[PDB]
């Protein structure tokens, strides 16, 4: 059966999927990954800056594997220097429109939702009320490595104190965290990023534009005491940048409360 072999290769995709993928592949055939400071960045074209941010961020995440065979194969082709299929496939899964700007964080998490981690990772949250008692919520694998809604590890680990259900005060706090890396994403947040403080994070994405909208994105990496800014095929370096941060990538966690 045609349907079955397709689902095997691409996962449970909708009827329009193959036409959208193949077409995107034709459309993005002119795009190019260029070498910038010895790494690959997607050269700006057709509002594709969000894809540069997505793909350069993915390239920093060791131990990920895609559970969809076509996506894993394209991913390995990309790692080997031929990124057309991967670009077109993530645009297809993301329901992206060629030539339109799009939301890099949203797409990044849509892509990672199709991935698994090739090693153990665990995140354990403790909830406890003075009435209800205790319960632990355990996330494993790739899900333990990503979190939306905060952009610092201090915030992530901060005890939360809320209104329960019965009427007693309920508490929530991260109590164990072991990962190979940690991706935190939030809404565009103006920060002065500086390498004099020597930050804990190793990379972050930057949103340019009005913060209610889909914007334009710059990928940034920390290296050699500098911020390396990859603006869709061009690289520049700075010690200091006032910018709106969205995604922030941290090294592996090894934490117990
Ligand atoms: Zn309670």
Numbering used by the authors: 63 to 319
Question: What does the published report state?
Answer:
Pp1a and pp1ab are processed by two virus-encoded cysteine proteases, termed the papain-like protease (PLpro) and the 3C-like protease (3CLpro). Together, these two proteases cleave the polyproteins to produce 16 nonstructural proteins (nsps), which are essential for the formation of the replicase complex and hence RNA replication. SARS PLpro is a highly efficient deubiquitinating (DUB) enzyme having the ability to rapidly hydrolyze isopeptide bonds of proteins that are post-translationally modified by cellular ubiquitin-like (Ubl) molecules, such as ubiquitin (Ub) and interferon-stimulating gene 15 (ISG15), which are two key regulators of the innate immune response.
We also report the first X-ray crystal structure of a CoV PLpro or PLP2 without its flanking Ubl2 domain. The 60 amino acids encoding for the Ubl2 domain at the N-terminus and a single cysteine from the C-terminus of PLpro were removed. PLpro-ΔUbl2 crystallized in space group P 1 2 1 with one biologically active monomer in the asymmetric unit. X-ray data were collected to 1.95 Å, and the final X-ray data collection and refinement statistics are summarized in Table 1. The MERS-CoV PLpro-ΔUbl2 structure contains only the catalytic domain of PLpro with its three subdomains: thumb, fingers, and palm. Similar to the MERS PLpro-Ubl2 structure, the catalytic Cys111 in the MERS-CoV PLpro-ΔUbl2 structure is also modified by β-mercaptoethanol (BME) with a partial occupancy of 0.83. Due to the partially modified Cys111, His278 is observed to occupy at least one alternative position in order to accommodate the bulky, modified Cys111 residue. The MERS-CoV PLpro catalytic domain is observed to adopt a conformation that is nearly identical to the structure with the Ubl2 domain intact. The resulting root-mean-square-deviation (RMSD) is 0.4 Å when the Cα of 254 residues in PLpro-ΔUbl2 are aligned with Cα of 258 residues in PLpro-Ubl2. Truncation of the Ubl2 domain appears to cause only slight deviations in the ridge helix of the thumb domain due to the loss of two helix residues, Thr61 and Ala62.
